[PDB]
């Protein structure tokens, strides 16, 4: 989408995976979906270095709305949970140097069953712009046909444009299409800054494997379409929650960098481990994700329960991820000829290799004919950066 936004993948925080649709502020006031939750997250995004690392979008997912529209046909923030309204939340967020994201749905209801934007695209778009919203995640539930789905996504894109406000537009468009038809990513890119392709992530290694496997299986359809202003979205970072081993967390961070994915944390910034914080704020890995060239990486090869992925970077640099998918035993050795990397030009005539994950370490120079040996933990990943010597 040619709105000057998302020239690198969008970085932020999104409540959904960790906090979901919790409406019970009686019993669980510190975890229910309320203005206080987002105000606290915004405070910690500044104070705990998240904004400095590059995470600038604080995003409300589903279950922020009142059950009904007001008498002027506008979406309302829940009166009990957002008593001061979204404008005041937006102003608070902007005062921290952050940006506010919000959620709506192309169909008649949100996926959680709250008011949809069908019949109200212009009104909702203007409401959001008038509130000071900076990002819109636009979901695809309760839409009665794929033609209405596509039309609505295009209408909302133009409606947001007409407001004149800079609003990052996130479309779940192709995710609801894939089961029935192959999406037209050329069309989707014209209207969207990024797009969810596949099923919702959850707090598990299984979920992460399915997203990677779906992405690598379908990489010829989706990789080349991605670029500055338009990204594939494999869903939220779930690092720092409950269901992932340390190695599986390193794997998600590494592969989301390789995939040029938007980096939307979904965790509790109030209660997050030092190690999870360090991984998510890793400047060298974020630098790969944020690389200005914006070429999405891909799976180079798979076999013997290993995978090798790579991503071309600006300045003739390459990022290389090697994943160990064998979930038994100990660290397993993997040897690759560097000549196989970067279409043969990464290390022609030579390259300097630095390991970034699981620990940062310089590995020295490598001639075009040389081989790289690494030991990779089960479900873990080794992430390398290659610098050409020319």
Ligand X SMILES: *[C@@H]1O[C@H](CO)[C@@H](O[C@@H]2O[C@H](CO)[C@@H](O[C@@H]3O[C@H](CO)[C@@H](O)[C@H](O)[C@@H]3O)[C@H](O)[C@H]2NC(C)=O)[C@H](O)[C@H]1NC(C)=O
Ligand Y SMILES: *[C@@H]1O[C@H](CO)[C@@H](O)[C@H](O)[C@H]1NC(C)=O
Ligand Z SMILES: CC(=O)N[C@@H]1[C@@H](O)[C@@H](O)[C@@H](CO)O[C@@H]1O
Ligand U SMILES: *[C@@H]1O[C@H](CO)[C@@H](O[C@@H]2O[C@H](CO)[C@@H](O[C@@H]3O[C@H](CO)[C@@H](O)[C@H](O[C@H]4O[C@H](CO)[C@@H](O)[C@H](O)[C@@H]4O)[C@@H]3O)[C@H](O)[C@H]2NC(C)=O)[C@H](O)[C@H]1NC(C)=O
Ligand V SMILES: *[C@@H]1O[C@H](CO)[C@@H](O[C@@H]2O[C@H](CO)[C@@H](O[C@@H]3O[C@H](CO)[C@@H](O)[C@H](O[C@H]4O[C@H](CO)[C@@H](O)[C@H](O)[C@@H]4O)[C@@H]3O)[C@H](O)[C@H]2NC(C)=O)[C@H](O[C@@H]2O[C@@H](C)[C@@H](O)[C@@H](O)[C@@H]2O)[C@H]1NC(C)=O
Binding track over 173-212 against ligand V, x by CB under 6 A: -----------x-xx-------------------------
Q: What span, in angstroms and rounded, lies between the C-alpha atoms of 266 and 35?
A: 17
Those residues whose C-beta lies under 8 Å from the C-beta of residue 49, and which sit 6 or more positions away, are 281
Classify 47 as helix, strand or coil: helix
Minimum CB separation of residue 45 from ligand Z in Å reads 20
Q: What span, in angstroms and rounded, lies between the C-alpha atoms of 325 and 347?
A: 26
Active-site residue, 70 included: no
Matching residue, tokens 């310089």 = 362
Judged by CB, which is closer to ligand X: 139, or 268?
139
Residue 166 within binding range of ligand U, rule CB under 6 A: yes
Number of H helices, E strands in the chain: 13, 16
Minimum CB separation of residue 12 from a copy of itself in Å reads 19
Residue 186 within binding range of ligand U, rule CB under 6 A: no
Judged by CB, which is closer to ligand X: 54, or 116?
116
Active-site residue, 203 included: no
Minimum CB separation of residue 333 from a copy of itself in Å reads 7
Minimum CB separation of residue 111 from ligand Z in Å reads 3
Residue 281 within binding range of ligand V, rule CB under 6 A: no
Residue 220 within binding range of ligand V, rule CB under 6 A: no
What does 139 bind: a copy of itself, ligand Z, ligand V, none (CB cut-off 5 to 8 Å by kind)?
A: ligand Z
Residue 202 within binding range of ligand Z, rule CB under 6 A: no
Please pick, from the candidates 110, 117, 170, 248, the single residue that binds a copy of itself as defined by CB under 8 A: 248
Please pick, from the candidates 108, 163, 355, 389, the single residue that binds ligand X as defined by CB under 6 A: 108
- Say how far residue 348 (Cα) sits from the centre of its chain: 33
Minimum CB separation of residue 222 from ligand Y in Å reads 14
Q: What span, in angstroms and rounded, lies between the C-alpha atoms of 141 and 125?
A: 18
| C-alpha distances out from residue 374 to 131, 348, 369, 371, 380, Å | 51, 21, 17, 10, 12
Which range, of 36-44, 140-148, 266-274, 367-375, touches ligand Y by CB under 6 A?
A: 140-148
Answer whether 372's CB lies under 8 Å from 353's CB. yes
Angle separating helix axes 246-258 and 205-217, nearest 10 degrees: 30
| C-alpha distances out from residue 50 to 6, 239, 250, 261, 331, Å | 18, 14, 18, 17, 32
Binding residues for ligand X (CB under 6 A): 107-108, 118, 143-144, 148
Residues annotated catalytic, as ranges: 139, 200
């Amino acid at each position: 989408l040619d709105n000057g936004l998302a020239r690198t993948p969008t970085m932020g925080w999104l409540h959904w995976e960790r906090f979901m649709c919790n409406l019970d502020c009686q019993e669980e006031p510190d975890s229910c979906i309320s203005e206080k939750l987002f105000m606290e997250m915004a405070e910690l995004m500044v104070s705990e270095g998240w904004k400095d690392a590059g995470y600038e979008y604080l995003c409300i997912d589903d279950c922020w709305m009142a059950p009904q529209r007001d008498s002027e046909g506008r979406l309302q923030a829940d009166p009990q949970r957002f008593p001061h309204g979204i404008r005041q939340l937006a102003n608070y967020v902007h005062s921290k140097g952050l940006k506010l994201g919000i959620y709506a749905d192309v169909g008649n209801k949100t996926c959680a069953g709250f008011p949809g934007s069908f019949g109200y695209y212009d009104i909702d778009a203007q409401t959001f712009a008038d509130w000071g919203v900076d990002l819109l995640k636009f979901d695809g539930c309760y839409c009665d046909s794929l033609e209405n789905l596509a039309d609505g996504y295009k209408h909302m894109s133009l409606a947001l444009n007409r407001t004149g406000r800079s609003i990052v537009y996130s479309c779940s468009w192709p995710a609801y299409m894939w089961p029935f038809q192959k999406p037209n990513y050329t069309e989707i890119r014209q209207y969207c800054n990024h797009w969810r392709n596949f099923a919702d992530i959850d707090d598990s290694w299984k979920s992460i494997k399915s997203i990677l496997d779906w992405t690598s299986f379908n990489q010829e359809r989706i990789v080349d379409v991605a670029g500055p202003g338009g990204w594939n979205d494999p869903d939220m970072l779930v690092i720092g929650n409950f269901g992932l081993s340390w190695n599986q967390q390193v794997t998600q961070m590494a592969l989301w960098a390789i995939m040029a994915a938007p980096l939307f944390m979904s965790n509790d910034l109030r209660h997050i481990s030092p190690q999870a914080k360090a991984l998510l704020q890793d400047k060298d890995v974020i630098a790969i994700n944020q690389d200005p060239l914006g070429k999405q990486g891909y799976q180079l090869r798979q076999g013997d329960n290993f995978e090798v992925w790579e991503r071309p970077l600006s300045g003739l640099a390459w990022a290389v991820a090697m994943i160990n998918r064998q979930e038994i035993g100990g660290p397993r050795s993997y040897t690759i000829a560097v000549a196989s990397l970067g279409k043969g030009v990464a290390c022609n005539p030579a390259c300097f290799i630095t390991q970034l994950l699981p620990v940062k370490r310089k590995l020295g120079f490598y001639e075009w004919t040389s081989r790289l040996r690494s030991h990779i933990n089960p479900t873990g990943t080794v992430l390398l950066q290659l610098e050409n010597t020319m």
